[PDB]
């Protein structure tokens, strides 16, 4: 009766931050209740721990109030059979909302909307009579979003908030032998939502596991581990504090044993009863053991040395009541003298922020996915990850512990959408709610070695609540530093200056919360903390420009210990078309309102875990070996702090314009922080013209746990020499004929013919034989289909006049009209010479001026020479080159320049100069939100079909015009055009990326010279 919906729902606990839970057990590290020490030791599975994951019955309602009392007693006819865990939006019930800042619901704390999507889950299951004789049977939900009430066998059990941490209830007295039934009612919105405003899809449900754990009556209630070291780490102390619940009987003992493999390293036994703590005594229900470990193997992301710790609760006669365990990693984390140290050396964090996202499963995580992510990261030169912005699925820590990644664990607290940001975090009334989001995280994850820093949440301004919570942590677990960026990045609530999007060299001095240039921030008066960016280098779409600038500061300034790139995966979701064809969806694609569109796609990898090209630029910049070339000696520097180059080979090689002349291989013997000298054999040197390039690669000959054999971990290339070509071509056998007309000029020579339209001034067509080559005339191009960064936050509604695109738009770039100023043909001794001039103007303003000369010679080669003039007072153009639509469509593209991957000017350090050959398909980058892409810089020669262009340029080539790109919201809607679109740039502006909501292109990468010159040679084979 008092179990009635009617009664229960009445209190509206989900509209009250003063009730965060009802009848929930305390937090603690992961338990299994093994009843045999070996299983515990070997991490075998505990029969005392049962999963309730699977098929559950579910029914959706628009408001908690629309639930029928019946539900409590019996299933529902119309209840569907759903799989758990899952996100009900993933099943169709309601839509997922992709909003960033702006809260999904209306801001009226602590109220929530009356229309509040309720999901009723139910499960019928069996409890074995043995579980009811003794012990305690409790239930666990690893993640319920956002809040929920619970009934068992028609009785009300409890309530819980906090989507990202476990809620546990003792079912001990509601359970009946055999058949039991659970009724779980999950509310989408609650007062907890006010604290969960992270930039991500807004979903709901029982999205993490459900389990049953059977514990003895007298049991281990919690335990913590700690490791102290001596000056040189040659000796450690493992300290374990154990607490128990139940009746304390003198025959009770505890044994803590430390294994390393099969080998027991240390063991300790004792009975309950701690040291005197105060005037009343000590804890009789606790015991602390201390094990001495000589020459412990240390844990690090470089070498994840782990031990196993077993905690046995037994009686003195040797009888085991129960056992728990955890992996142990010996490491010390400290900030000392402005530096963050790990095991005494200073880290350089090569990290990334990662959300729990699956395109198919929404926010439900699985082992496979976790592992994939981990390996990609490790393969790509990452050390660390930040749990943006809440505690993750438990297994995560374990994997990191094991594979080796540093983890920053973060409280599930984000109130980004309040005004001001502080509003709740400065309010004592939210102190409790917040408090639980921090404390429980710590109680749960504190024993993992991978966790090296605690974070108070994200973007919730800076309030007195943070200060308190930060102090709490420091008191409770001084083993790790605390960080929080809110309120300016350097408040009293953080041990590290941890801004987001601070530029390297430029300051952004917003009122109250400026973002100084990182190099400058450190030397502000009185400042002494280390600086590590919590988010930097916004990887949204065609991005990552300038990435290297960061890497370089990091390397030059000690107190700049790296940062976390934003972010790992694109938060795109899968949708299906008219023919059961899938496609990547984003903000607002689910009729979701209000929404932030593409803003959910900032990953380095696509939702399927396939990489964006940016990923390489990272990989290379973050590489652990560094090179310098001096004469014919290569100096190698190791950035490893703990390990020796012991699975590393260096391959070297010399080549002249793509042609290999020499190769070597040399095994690296460099210690962490060491140098290795490498002298090369006498290097060949040819008479032939061209550039000679040295390229080196570090290879991992043997496979590791996260890499295959032959994995390349680093590389670098240098230009060694140049033999300039002092050779004049063979005087043409033939001579081209010029046929004039009033419409055009024709040039014929051989089967070849070229036509220039005298009215437009462009080369309108060309034939090889009877076949035409163009579909579109060759013409000047000064624009580009806007990248995400060019656009920023500019919308049709709300225009951002500062966004590059807006400027360009406003100035007429996109709609300027050419103007023939001149077009002449002249006959040279051995060639024809065409000469043109256009002016591009908009509203009587001449933006640019293009002046060319085409010169066709007996060789049947045309040489284009171009010279642009850009008005000082017009926004600098995105680019400067030509384009045209070719008639042909070939299978491959071959070029001699940077590649193989897409590379832009402020994003090309990872690319190598060489001869690349790839399929056309590979020259297009499927950024879900179409834009200019696929560029390759420093090209010297490009070959497509019978064409060959030569010079110094950047280019791109696909089946999509710039216009089509520019006009398609999703990549799935693009259609291949008639032939091949070719864009050949003499120059291209950088892509930026410091952030994606303000101009981020550094000046060095802006086409601001005024005068631009370039030349080409088009010809055939």
């Amino acid at each position: 009766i008092t179990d009635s919906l009617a009664v229960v729902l009445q209190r509206r606990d989900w509209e009250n931050p003063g009730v965060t839970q009802l009848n929930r057990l305390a937090a603690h590290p992961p338990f299994a209740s093994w009843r045999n020490s070996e299983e515990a030791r070997t991490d075998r599975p505990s029969q005392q721990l049962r999963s309730l994951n699977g098929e559950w019955r579910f029914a959706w309602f628009p408001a908690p109030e629309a639930v029928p009392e019946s539900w409590l007693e019996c299933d529902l006819p119309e209840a569907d059979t759903v799989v758990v865990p899952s996100n009900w939006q993933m099943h169709g019930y309601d839509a997922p909302i992709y909003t960033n800042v702006t809260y999904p619901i209306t801001v009226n704390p602590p109220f929530v909307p009356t229309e509040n999507p309720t999901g009723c889950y139910s499960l019928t299951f069996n409890v074995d009579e043995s579980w009811l004789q003794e012990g305690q049977t409790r239930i666990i939900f690893d993640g319920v979003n956002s809040a929920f009430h619970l009934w068992c066998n028609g009785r009300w059990v409890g309530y819980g908030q906090d989507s990202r941490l476990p809620s546990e209830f003792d079912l001990s007295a509601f359970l009946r032998a055999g058949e039991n039934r659970l009724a779980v009612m999950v509310l989408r919105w609650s007062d907890g939502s006010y604290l969960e405003d992270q930039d991500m899809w807004r979903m709901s449900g029982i999205f993490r596991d459900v389990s049953l754990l059977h514990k003895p009556t007298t049991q281990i209630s919690d335990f913590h581990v700690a490791t102290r070291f001596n000056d040189d780490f040659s000796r450690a102390v493992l300290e374990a504090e154990v607490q128990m619940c139940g009746e304390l009987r003198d025959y009770l003992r505890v044994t803590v044993s430390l294994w390393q493999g099969e080998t027991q390293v240390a063991s300790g036994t004792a009975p309950f009863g701690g040291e005197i703590i105060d005037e009343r005594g000590g804890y009789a229900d606790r015991v602390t053991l201390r094990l001495n470990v000589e020459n412990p193997k240390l844990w690090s992301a470089e070498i994840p040395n782990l031990y196993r710790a077993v905690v046995e609760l037994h009686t003195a006669d040797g009888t085991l009541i129960e056992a728990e365990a955890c992996d142990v990693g010996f490491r010390e984390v400290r900030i000392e003298n402005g530096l963050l140290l790990l095991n005494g050396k200073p880290l350089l964090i090569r990290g990334v922020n990662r959300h729990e996202h699956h395109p198919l499963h929404g926010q439900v995580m699985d082992e496979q996915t976790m592992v994939q992510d981990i390996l990609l990261m490790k393969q790509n030169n990452f050390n660390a990850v930040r749990c943006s912005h809440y505690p993750n699925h438990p297994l995560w820590y374990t994997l990191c512990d094991r594979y080796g990644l540093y983890v920053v664990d973060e409280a599930n607290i984000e109130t980004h959408g309040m005004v001001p940001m502080n509003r709740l975090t400065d309010d004592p009334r939210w102190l409790p709610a917040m408090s639980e989001r921090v404390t429980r995280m710590v109680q749960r994850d504190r024993n993992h070695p991978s966790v090296i820093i605690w974070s108070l949440g994200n973007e919730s301004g800076h309030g007195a609540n943070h200060d308190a919570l930060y102090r709490w942590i420091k008191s409770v677990d001084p083993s790790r530093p605390v960080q929080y960026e809110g309120g300016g990045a350097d408040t009293t609530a953080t041990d590290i200056i941890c801004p987001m999007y601070a530029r390297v060299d430029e300051d952004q001095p917003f009122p109250a919360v400026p973002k100084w240039s990182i190099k400058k921030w450190l030397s502000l008066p009185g400042e002494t903390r280390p600086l590590i960016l919590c988010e930097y280098a916004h990887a949204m779409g065609n991005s990552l420009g300038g990435f290297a600038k960061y890497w370089q500061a990091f390397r030059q300034y000690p107190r700049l210990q790296g940062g976390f790139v934003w972010d790992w995966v694109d938060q795109s979701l899968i949708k299906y078309d008219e023919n059961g064809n899938p496609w990547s969806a984003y903000g607002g694609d689910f009729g979701d309102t209000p929404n932030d569109r593409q803003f959910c796609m900032n990953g380095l990898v696509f939702a399927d875990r396939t990489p964006h090209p940016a990923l390489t630029e990272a990989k290379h910049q973050q590489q652990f070996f560094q090179f310098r070339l001096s004469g014919q000696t290569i100096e190698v520097t190791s950035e490893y702090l703990f390990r020796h180059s012991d699975n590393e080979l260096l391959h070297w090689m010399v080549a002249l314009d793509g042609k290999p002349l020499a190769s070597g291989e040399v095994p690296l013997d460099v210690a962490p922080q060491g140098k290795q000298l490498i002298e090369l054999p006498e290097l060949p040197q040819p008479e032939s013209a061209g550039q000679l390039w040295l390229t080196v690669r570090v290879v991992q000959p043997n496979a590791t746990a996260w890499s295959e054999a032959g994995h390349i971990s680093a590389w670098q290339q240098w230009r060694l020499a140049e033999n300039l070509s002092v050779t004049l071509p063979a005087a043409s056998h033939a001579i081209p004929h010029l046929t004039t007309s009033e419409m055009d000029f024709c040039i014929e020579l051989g089967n070849k013919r070229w036509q220039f339209n005298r009215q437009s001034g462009f080369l309108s067509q060309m034939w090889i034989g009877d076949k035409k080559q163009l579909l579109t005339p060759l013409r000047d191009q000064f624009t580009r289909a806007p990248l995400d960064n060019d656009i920023g936050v500019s919308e049709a509604t709300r225009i951002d006049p500062n966004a590059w695109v807006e400027r360009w738009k406003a100035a007429g770039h996109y709609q300027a009209e050419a103007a023939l100023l001149q077009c002449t043909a002249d006959t040279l001794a051995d060639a024809v010479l065409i000469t043109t001039a256009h002016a591009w103007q908009h509203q009587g303003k001449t933006l640019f001026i293009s002046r060319k000369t085409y010169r066709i010679d007996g060789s049947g080669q045309m040489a284009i020479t171009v010279d642009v003039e850009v008005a000082s007072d017009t926004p600098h153009p995105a680019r400067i080159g030509l384009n045209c639509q070719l008639a042909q469509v070939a299978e491959r593209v071959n070029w001699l320049g940077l590649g193989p991957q897409e590379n832009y000017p402020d994003r090309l350090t990872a690319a190598c100069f060489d001869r690349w050959d790839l399929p056309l398909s590979d020259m297009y980058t499927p950024y879900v939100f179409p834009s200019e892409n696929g560029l390759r810089c420093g090209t010297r020669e490009l070959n497509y079909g019978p064409h060959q262009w030569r010079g110094d340029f950047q280019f791109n080539i696909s089946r999509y015009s710039q216009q089509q790109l520019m006009e398609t919201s999703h990549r799935h809607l693009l259609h291949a055009e008639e032939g091949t679109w070719l864009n050949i740039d003499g120059f291209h502006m950088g892509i930026g990326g410091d952030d994606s909501w303000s101009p981020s292109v550094s000046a060095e990468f802006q086409l601001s010279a005024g005068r631009y010159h370039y030349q080409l040679v088009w010809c055939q084979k």
Partner: antibody, heavy 113, light 107 residues
Framework: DVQLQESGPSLVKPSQTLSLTCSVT????????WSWIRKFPGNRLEYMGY???????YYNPSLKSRISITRDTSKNQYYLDLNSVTTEDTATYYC???????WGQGTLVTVSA | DIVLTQSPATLSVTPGNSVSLSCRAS??????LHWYQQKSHESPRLLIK???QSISGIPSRFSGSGSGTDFTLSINSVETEDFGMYFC?????????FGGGTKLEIK
């Protein structure tokens, strides 16, 4: 609930292209990763490949570029195309989701002159 | 590629008795080892995933253990419906590969 079913020719000639269709009912093809697995007459199983949500494909190197896996959301089906088949391609072909929870009934395809 | 070797190739047992099947990887695959059952004229059925994780709808008598290179599938008190083929499959690295299989028969 979800159901998968293979369809297509049971007998093909050497050198031709073997093409099978996997019809998915109960849920959208955009809601999972899809695979093709085959069992050779001698009880040997081979994972041919799979297509994930982004459209990226993964093919077994043993298939020497003869394989193509595609999708059609409008028909809620995905396909397997194996070119230049030989007697070595005689096997029972199955479609299943990446998780391995849902499998088709399997269809025998014999390659004979 | 990763090679999975299963042993024994064939195992005969009398219903009621328990058995354990072995699967070893040529190199470490962490916990990415799954177990499948396959009967004549039928598609494979997933029994255990990621070395030891249980699957809804599978008899409780099936359990998995192991990590790295050595894994085991155990059947506590074999039933007649258990006779057939058992294959392990790794998903740690592409291409995914299957073991050669172990045939479980009545003795």
């Amino acid at each position: 609930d979800v159901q998968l079913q293979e369809s297509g020719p049971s007998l093909v000639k050497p050198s031709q292209t073997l093409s099978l269709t996997c019809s998915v009912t109960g849920d959208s093809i955009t809601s999972d990763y899809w695979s093709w697995i085959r069992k050779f007459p001698g009880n040997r199983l081979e994972y041919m490949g799979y297509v994930s949500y982004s459209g990226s494909t993964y093919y077994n190197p043993s298939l020497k570029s003869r394989i193509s896996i595609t999708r059609d959301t409008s028909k809620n089906q995905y396909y397997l195309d194996l070119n230049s088949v030989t007697t070595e391609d005689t096997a029972t072909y199955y479609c299943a989701n990446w998780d391995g929870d849902y499998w088709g009934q399997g269809t025998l395809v014999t390659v004979s002159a | 590629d990763i090679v999975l070797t299963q042993s024994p190739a064939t195992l005969s047992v009398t219903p009621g008795n328990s058995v354990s099947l072995s699967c070893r990887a040529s190199q470490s695959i962490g916990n990415d080892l799954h177990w499948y059952q396959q009967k004549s004229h039928e598609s494979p059925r997933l029994l255990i995933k990621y070395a030891s994780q249980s699957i809804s709808g599978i008899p409780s008598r099936f359990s998995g253990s192991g990590s790295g290179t050595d894994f085991t599938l155990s059947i506590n008190s074999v039933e007649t419906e258990d006779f057939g083929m058992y294959f392990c499959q790794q998903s740690n690295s592409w291409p995914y590969t299957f073991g050669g299989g172990t045939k479980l028969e009545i003795k």
